A paper describes a structure:
RECQL5 is a regulator of transcription elongation known to interact directly with Pol II, thereby playing important roles in suppressing genome instability. In this study, we solved several cryo-EM structures of Pol II ECs complexed with RECQL5 in different nucleotide-binding states of the helicase. The RECQL5 IRI module, encompassing the αN helix and KIX domain, wraps around the surface of the RPB1 lower jaw with exquisite molecular complementarity, serving as an anchor point of RECQL5 on Pol II.
By selecting particles without RECQL5, we were able to solve the structure of a free EC containing only Pol II and the nucleic acid scaffold at 2.6 Å overall resolution (ECFree). The good local resolution (2.3–3.1 Å) attained for the Pol II core region allowed us to assign unambiguously the DNA/RNA register. In ECFree, the tDNA i site base G14 is positioned a distance of 8.7 Å from the RPB1 bridge helix (Cα of RPB1 T854 taken as a reference point). Moreover, when superimposed on the bridge helix, ECFree showed great similarity to the Pol II–α-amanitin structure (RMSD = 0.5 Å).
Numbering used by the authors:
A (entry chain A): 1416 to 1486
B (entry chain B): 148 to 196
C (entry chain C): 2 to 132, 146 to 271
D (entry chain K): 1 to 115
E (entry chain F): 46 to 127
F (entry chain J): 1 to 67
G (entry chain A): 355 to 910
H (entry chain A): 11 to 102
Amino acid sequence: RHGVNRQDTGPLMKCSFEETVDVLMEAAAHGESDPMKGVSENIMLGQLAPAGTGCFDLLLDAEKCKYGMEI
Amino acid sequence: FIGKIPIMLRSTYCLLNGLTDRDLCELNECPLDPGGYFIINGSEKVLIA
Amino acid sequence: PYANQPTVRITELTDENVKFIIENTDLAVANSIRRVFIAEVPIIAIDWVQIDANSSVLHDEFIAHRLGLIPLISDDIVDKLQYSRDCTCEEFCPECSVEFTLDVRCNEDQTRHVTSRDLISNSPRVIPVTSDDILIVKLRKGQELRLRAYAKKGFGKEHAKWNPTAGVAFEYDPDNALRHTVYPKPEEWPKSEYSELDEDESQAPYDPNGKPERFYYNVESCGSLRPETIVLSALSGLKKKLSDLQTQLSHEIQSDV
Amino acid sequence: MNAPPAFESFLLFEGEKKITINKDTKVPNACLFTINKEDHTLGNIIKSQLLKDPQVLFAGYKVPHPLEHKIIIRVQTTPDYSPQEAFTNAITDLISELSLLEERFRVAIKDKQEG
Amino acid sequence: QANQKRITTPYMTKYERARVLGTRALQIAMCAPVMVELEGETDPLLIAMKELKARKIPIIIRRYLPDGSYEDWGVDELIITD
Amino acid sequence: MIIPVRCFTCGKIVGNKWEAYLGLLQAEYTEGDALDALGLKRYCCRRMLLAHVDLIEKLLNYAPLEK
Amino acid sequence: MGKRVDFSARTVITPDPNLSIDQVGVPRSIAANMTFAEIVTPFNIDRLQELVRRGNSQYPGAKYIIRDNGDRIDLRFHPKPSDLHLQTGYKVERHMCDGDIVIFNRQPTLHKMSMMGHRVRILPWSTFRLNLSVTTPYNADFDGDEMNLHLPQSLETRAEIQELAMVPRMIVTPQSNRPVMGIVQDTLTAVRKFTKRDVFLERGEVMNLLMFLSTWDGKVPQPAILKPRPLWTGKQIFSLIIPGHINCIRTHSTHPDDEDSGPYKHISPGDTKVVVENGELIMGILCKKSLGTSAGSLVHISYLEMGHDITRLFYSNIQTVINNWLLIEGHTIGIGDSIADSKTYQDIQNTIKKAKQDVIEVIEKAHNNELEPTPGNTLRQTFENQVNRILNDARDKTGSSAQKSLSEYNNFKSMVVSGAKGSKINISQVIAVVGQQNVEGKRIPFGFKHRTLPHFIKDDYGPESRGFVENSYLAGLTPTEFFFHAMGGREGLIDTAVKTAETGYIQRRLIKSMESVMVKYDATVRNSINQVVQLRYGEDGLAGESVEFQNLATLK
Amino acid sequence: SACPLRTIKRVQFGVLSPDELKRMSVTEGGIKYPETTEGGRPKLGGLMDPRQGVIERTGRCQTCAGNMTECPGHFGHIELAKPVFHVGFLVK
Amino acid sequence: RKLRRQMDIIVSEVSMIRDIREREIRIYTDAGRICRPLLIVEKQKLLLKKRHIDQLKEREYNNYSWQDLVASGVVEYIDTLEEETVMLAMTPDDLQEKEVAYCSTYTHCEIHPSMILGVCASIIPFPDHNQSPRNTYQSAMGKQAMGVYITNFHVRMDTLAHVLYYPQKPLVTTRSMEYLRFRELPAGINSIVAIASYTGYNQEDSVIMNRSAVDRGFFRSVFYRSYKEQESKKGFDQEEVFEKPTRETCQGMRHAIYDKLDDDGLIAPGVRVSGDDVIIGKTVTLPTKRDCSTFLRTSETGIVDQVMVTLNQEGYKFCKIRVRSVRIPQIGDKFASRHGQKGTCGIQYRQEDMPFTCEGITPDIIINPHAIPSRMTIGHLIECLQGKVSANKGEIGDATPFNDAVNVQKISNLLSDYGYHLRGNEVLYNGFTGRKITSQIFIGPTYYQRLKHMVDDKIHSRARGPIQILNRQPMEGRSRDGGLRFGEMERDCQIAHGAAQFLRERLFEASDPYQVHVCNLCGIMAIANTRTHTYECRGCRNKTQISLVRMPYACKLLFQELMSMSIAPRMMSV
Amino acid sequence: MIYICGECHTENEIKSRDPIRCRECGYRIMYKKRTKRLVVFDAR
Amino acid sequence: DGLKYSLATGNWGDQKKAHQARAGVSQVLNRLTFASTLSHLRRLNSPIGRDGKLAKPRQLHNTLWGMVCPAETPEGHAVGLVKNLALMAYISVGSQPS
DNA sequence: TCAAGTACTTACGCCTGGTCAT
RNA sequence: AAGACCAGGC
Ligand SMILES: [Zn+2]
Ligand SMILES: [Zn+2]
Ligand SMILES: [Zn+2]
Ligand SMILES: [Zn+2]
Ligand SMILES: [Zn+2]
């Protein structure tokens, strides 16, 4: 906890390791903001973590769709 | 009367003390049962040293 | 590409055991005949048990399992009987089953041994191997056992109750000539009952040109079938399986071509 | 709770063919026989009989899974000799051997009893 | 970023491959037109696989660089390991 | 509990040999001799009677539920 | 950070050598309970209609129908015909079937190979069945062990597991750039017995073995021996299992250290070493050094050259064909493997007696102040050093004597040289001497006043009083030796029961320290705050799965 | 479900001011009664407040369509007679 | 010491310790001191003479017992701190005799060194030939073996009672099993066990069982489950009555079948009950009726054995229903010998498929040879050898630990006298092909145990069932149809896989999926009336800019708990 | 509804809302008198 | 009620003081096997915490010879802590030293 | 500035079941 | 209805 909770990471990442309520009280008192860039933070809020298969984004190519069969 | 002390089975103050195997089977009690436990609300409890 | 001509030499023939030697046949044929002795020889045994009263210290399925393991004399009517699956009747009928009745109550202070002798069959020929007696359950005074049981036709593949034989002794190459087993110390192995070598030598010299033949058998019947009838039924059943497979293969060849 | 019935090893249920004949495309004059509700008793004896045929190049059997009840017999033969013909010949051979064995065993039983 | 000056692996990553395959299989299972000619293929996962082998999946992979920039790579522009 | 029928390994009838085994033990025979007298040759059959404990006799000391 | 999940199954695991590496045996009840929602298309509308018709009762059926409105028609309770209508867009929750992708886990999940994706194979009875080469990644054995079955519920997560977490894709770990799976147990022992020169196979035996080779081209190879009778060799058949054209060189466990220097370097008089050229086992006897989970092994080369799909077939074919050959040869353990010769027993006893006399002499020197303390050690410390040296040398000598007495038919030696199970110390303890029993790295402490047990006199520093078991397991331990062995094994039991918590805490601390550290799209390793932990991963930008041990040949 | 679906890109922490708690609170005047029910029905201003959530699992919230599953629960408040130190914030 | 030996003033419990170096004599009479009897050695001779043994041999009808032995000054109870000052001889005929002198001042002798073991460790044959962890494992496993746990199990209404069909006393026994009453109540069957590699299904720790033997009753068992239920009078008019409910008289009702109940709402014994069937029918009067009936544990499929009706302490109706189920050993059940060799049943082969000797013997159990070398249970092998000797001879083998008269060579020589290879190896034939196995197999009767752990009691499958009231996540436990926990280690493993979507499924979709409406200005959840579509944020007067956010229900609960602690976890979508 | 007493093993008939007490013995533990409907047991 | 509660729940002490009361005493007798019943009736407990990682109290002390079984120990978090009596082991019942 | 106290925390993974008293 | 404890499994 002394070293992982000292990193300038989000309060939600710290609250997942050994302090929880204390980290969140410190964040509330100081108005700390969680940029939601980590894995634990996104897992807590049920969002696709920026891990593999989540670190990129998929787009539909409309030009490439102009070659479809049974439309 | 001041209370009821749970009685360890097959002890001196148990009803199975001194009973023969025939007497024990007459009460549907196993002669090979060593006793040494208490019956609290049907459950058999054993005190660990 | 044709059939070898096997020969049989029977050495011992009792009411419990048949010891015979089959010569000039494949090891696979002999082992299949041995497997059919255990697996595919039809035999009548109790499979349907219904209990009216059971006050004994053994629960209902205990005594049912014990009843199913009681051998029944199925010497001739096993072939006449049909599998209950192949029978047109619903439930059970005399052409597919043999009914049994048990009614024992202990009234005396002496213990009552319920035996296979207390099994009563509707057929005079299917008897629980009682021309001692197999113990079903022991009854204290006041304990009763009444049940009805039907005996079905089956073989040992479905259940061991339909295994017509005790331990089937099988052996080939008594003196180790083919070296199908290698002894790290041959001198410390007892010589076989069928060994033909002297006390001085432990195993026969290796025969590179040899193949497994002259298979030694000792089929011990459990009394349900005569031990000679076990081998006859096994050969007939193996041939029946081969004939059915041939019929279906011929149909498949005609259909696909 | 997942116990298969004991008759599931020999009984053919609805729509299950006893034997299925499929050609093997890797090798010429080779076929694969799938026997349903059959085990080593027939497979080993058929494999052994097929090896007696000089025109059978390959003869083998296996059970893909012991918890399932199926035999795969792979038979390869010489040109101008179908593997199905070899299989039929092997089965007829086995039946002929079994009939002779049964007759000789009955004669031996008769000789042993009062003789 | 534009098509020129893309500084990223020309190879499709295994994570990109997995997500593209799953997304395209879901699209096919939801009645999306199949870009490749299928020969008795009814499993959307397998159709997505054969589109991937044919470089026909109409998906652009947007790769976000840690400085906030992104590069749009079409699936056909990436070289598949398989 | 009770003497099993059909010895587990081979399948020989051993359920009819418990009382005879007890009698042979009670009169003269040693256990090895008594097993031979009953024809129990294979040790799979011998262990059926040699290792058998007849708890059903102890179970008969309890009165039945119905008189 | 963790929670209970739907679509999960747990049951005991039992072996199945007839399953593939990526296959898992699943009981019918579990598959009839777990359901996968499948979107109906004109491609699968008829199949899903049949599944709906079968309902929840018949196993290859369905449990629910989800319409476009989101309303769920239950198919478990006599549904009404109109609610069984499947138009494109509906989701029918069909029962889990063969080939379904599932996540297989055995807690604790130490690494990512401890939770891999498998392929469902429905089998009778009620246990999960997994191939024995998958036992090593999970750290599993089949004594009451239970595993978890997580079934992905979407096509996207199904593809994720298929393309990332499949067992063949997890063969080589990035942890040590070695395989996590190898040929183990009966298959390894029978491979060792099958790869010797003496193994000559008949025609029918070869055909039966080839029937269990899935990658067989159908051509029976010409035998090594043509006359006087055709005989194929075990290496000849195994060369048909080796995928593609794999070039590999290994050594057997019993390889002498003089062969490479002297003659017969390329002839291998004991048939040791291992050479596989062009996917053909030219020479050598295989063991855990060739088919095990180690760097540069034959399976490792198969993965690095052929790929996961063919390596899976390699594993499965080895398992099947070698088990079916072992059906002929067989393997056992008995008293005869625990018994040595009379001369070996006498030699062991002479060694033990000499060691006890040496300890008595050291004790006499210490009692007469003739023991000069080694620098850096006290008098008691140097005395204990000398006594432990004598006893360890005695146990090593007795173990060597016991090992040299084993014949080639000995089964302890058979499972040791193959690497399947056991070691030379086990053979030594079974046959020669159990050895010294230590508590906290020292001889058995004086629990009583200046004596280990009441049966000894005070200040008894001899081997017997302090826990040296002169007897072997075959011989049996004396009561003092029995109690001292119990004291020694108690320490191992305590360590086993206490290590798990501390190691798990360390692992959790590490994972919380580095959970968000990943390789970015510019190949820089960064944390959640985009701080550059490493400019390139491993300082070289490579994954740990593909790298191999190599020599510079220009250094030194 | 007319509101657009959104992902949380940032979580801002802070201390709920008493004014914000009172504005947010669904009970008016605070929780004055410690009783849950008085006549078999949940009393307004008590611990079990129908404005605060769904009860009986088949009824509906007083502030929204509850269904016992769609209702996320609503906050109430207690106006303390005198200020009280916060244990979590006491060191601060 | 003389007084304690004569039992004049000092009772045998009292311990007397003389610390000679410290000049202290400590006498203890208090309770709790652990002591054991030891024979007394005066000079170099035991005080236990032949006359004491002769008198004890006639212990019946002689009134001569252990107390007479203690009162005669032959044996003495010594506790640990007095055992500090004692000089003990392990065996008399070895350590008190004159030899190369080690000790001549022996003051006590062990009665027998096998008495160091407890109840469960005394059932181990040849424990001194096993590794100590294996002895510990067997000591743990013996309490889990199934037999006849008590003779009056018929009258006992015990939850989770297991009784074995055919318990057998071991062919190889310890001299202490007589005093442990193990012969009377044994847990296990002497099984013909082949330590062999047959088809790979006994690999790792698994075992291969004979299906034909299992059919013949081998290791068959019965499972007894007792259900307790009690009528009660709690409310003024609320009461519980045992009765058979009708279709519409009870408010609550299950889709189960109540036709098996009697007029008293209790199923009679002999009625075959499957899963979900109602054991006891009970109704609760609601201040018409509410169903409180009890159902079977899922998939038990047993038959009602005994139903008991009585009155409890309060005098209310009290019922105990015992349901019996016969459990044939499957391929998931757990078996172990008395040497720590535990394992499940890999597969079952019938008699024809099992390997067979020249005499037709087929092993009941096949265990892998790989379980022996690392685990070093040589006592297992010696037990098998001695059991093979004893079954053929007709005696019961003696496996008391430290005998010095029962060697492996003696057992081998005895086995060689019955036509068998002295080391226990026997030539086996492949069941499938009939061919000899090249290696000869070690076969003999080894005592095996059937453990309480069975696959049917451990098999569970979850697919979207019950959820917890607070967390809205799947329930916990196989009995509650619960879902398996995807813990933090599993999450880390899936992070290492880079499977973000599967991780989201397990931690968001498979478990509780939820939606909330948060304000856009503040990050606090807003009142959302979906039917009326009136979304309002109390605190901003925000009715227009309110967003929909999908989050796990546990996360909403966490945020509400943080708000309960005055923390504002404002979820910002901008 | 016939119950079998556990002490004197006699059959007594009692109805609902009747305390359990065997006649002529005064014992409060009874048994259910196994049903008449027959259940088939496979002798397997 | 005090006796019945302390024997039933096992918390040795007053019900209101259950936390200060030692728990785990008076287990439910194990009827799985007769050997299990005997082992439960002859069983000793070390009151120290199971979560404690100290290995010394868990070790097999030399003084346990003939007093406590060297082999029967709860494998797991109670290794060395829960112990069982030897066959000949006896525990003094107490006497007045008058 | 310091440094020596003293208060104060914090370590088990998954799984089963049973019993007990609110 | 879900907590406490206990026992156990790997
Ligand atoms: Zn009919
Ligand atoms: Zn037998
Ligand atoms: Zn609401
Ligand atoms: Zn707002
Ligand atoms: Zn009465």
